[PDB]
Design a binder for this molecule. Structure first.
Ligand SMILES: OCCn1cccn1
Length: 175
């Protein structure tokens, strides 16, 4: 690895990771599962009603947005959502021990997974959690690749799975 290559891991963190997996959109759009989303992976509602999405948006941002936000607002909402995912892991009796056992890079993958699926969804992956705690990385990655989360929307999940396998940031290189 070059001097520049060795600096790459210092440029990656949970924010940069999710920013790549979720993208950045300033107008309401439907994600790969058909759910109204905005910003950096902020799911507004699972309701099919765009008015519901707009109502949630205005609530979240605090002004009359009419379905559009600024980059600064996207970033603030993103930081709030990341904090929520971390807090959700740390207070959960099943996820905290697994998270604590992980290295720094896999901890980011854990937060990313919770950001995407929510706490109960992730806490339901009983086998994967045991595999991770036992450092069975290849088995964990194969099992994640069986999930509906990954299979219904592979591009948003693939990088996370690779990161659980390797504990490096390589899947986020060379976009
Ligand atoms: O995403 C599976 C790993 N994980 C552990 C705690 C939260 N997530």
């Amino acid at each position: 690895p070059t001097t520049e290559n060795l600096y790459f891991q210092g440029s990656m963190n949970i924010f940069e990771m999710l920013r790549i997996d979720e993208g950045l959109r300033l107008k309401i759009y439907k994600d790969c599962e058909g759910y109204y989303t905005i910003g950096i992976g902020h799911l507004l509602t699972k309701s099919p009603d765009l008015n519901a999405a707009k109502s949630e948006l205005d609530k979240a941002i605090g002004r009359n947005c009419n379905g559009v936000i600024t980059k600064d607002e996207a970033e603030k909402l993103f930081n709030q959502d990341v904090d929520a995912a971390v807090r959700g892991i740390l207070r959960n009796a099943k996820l905290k021990p697994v998270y604590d056992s992980l290295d720094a890079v896999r901890r980011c993958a854990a937060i990313n997974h919770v950001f995407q699926m929510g706490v109960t969804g992730v806490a339901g992956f009983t086998n994967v959690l045991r595999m991770l705690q036992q450092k069975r990385w290849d088995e964990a990655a194969v099992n994640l690749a069986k999930s509906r989360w990954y299979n219904q929307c592979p591009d948003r999940a693939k990088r996370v799975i690779t990161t659980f396998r390797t504990g490096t940031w390589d899947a986020y290189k060379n976009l």
